[PDB]
Design a binder for this molecule. Structure first.
Ligand SMILES: NC(=O)[C@H]1CCCN(C(=O)Cc2ccccc2CO)C1
Ligand SMILES: [Zn+2]
Length: 139
C-alpha cells in the first residue's frame, strides 16, 4: 500500500484505488496502473522532473529503503493477475530488488523528488510506475 500526495492530488496504484478515489477521480490509466484523485488538504510530496536512473525505494515487506538502478520508462509485458489480464504495462521501470504482493505503492525517490511508485515485481525484481511525465500534478 501507499500513495503520493502533491498539491490537491493523491496518486495511487489503480488496482488499489478505493471507492473514495473513484468518487473524486481526476485521471486514471489501466495501461500504467495509475489513478489520481482530488484531495481537500494540501499534500506533503515534490515530484522529480529529471532523467535519473538511480534512486531509493521503500519496501514495506522489509520495513526498509533500498538503493536501485532502474531502466527508463517503457512498455513491459506483465503476467495476468486477479486485477488485470495479461498485457503490456506502459511507463514502467524495472530494477533488481526485493518486492512481494503488498509492496505496491512504496515510493521511489531520487535527489530531485518523487520518481514513481512500486507497481510490479517478482523473482528479485521490482517495477515502478513512473510519474515524472505528469506535469499537471504541479499545477
Ligand atoms: N501492475 C500490475 O499489473 C500488478 C498488479 C498486482 C499484481 N502484480 C504483481 O506484480 C504482484 C507481485 C508479484 C510478486 C512480487 C511482487 C509483486 C508486486 O507487489 C502486477
Ligand atoms: Zn532525479
Amino acid at each position: 500500500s501507499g500513495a503520493i500526495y502533491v498539491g490537491n492530488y493523491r496518486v495511487v496504484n489503480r488496482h488499489l484505488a478505493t471507492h473514495n478515489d473513484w468518487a473524486n477521480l481526476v485521471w486514471e490509466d489501466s495501461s500504467r496502473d495509475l489513478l489520481v484523485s482530488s484531495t481537500t488538504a494540501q499534500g506533503c510530496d515534490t515530484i522529480a522532473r529529471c532523467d535519473c536512473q538511480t534512486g531509493v525505494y521503500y519496501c514495506s515487506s522489509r520495513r526498509k529503503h533500498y538503493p536501485v538502478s532502474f531502466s527508463k520508462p517503457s512498455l513491459i509485458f506483465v503476467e495476468a493477475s486477479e486485477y488485470y489480464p495479461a498485457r503490456y504495462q506502459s511507463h514502467l521501470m524495472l530494477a533488481v530488488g526485493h518486492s512481494e504482493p503488498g509492496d505496491c505503492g512504496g515510493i521511489l525517490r531520487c535527489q530531485h523528488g518523487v520518481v514513481g511508485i512500486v507497481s510490479t515485481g517478482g523473482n528479485g525484481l521490482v517495477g515502478f510506475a513512473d510519474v515524472r511525465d505528469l506535469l499537471w500534478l504541479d499545477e
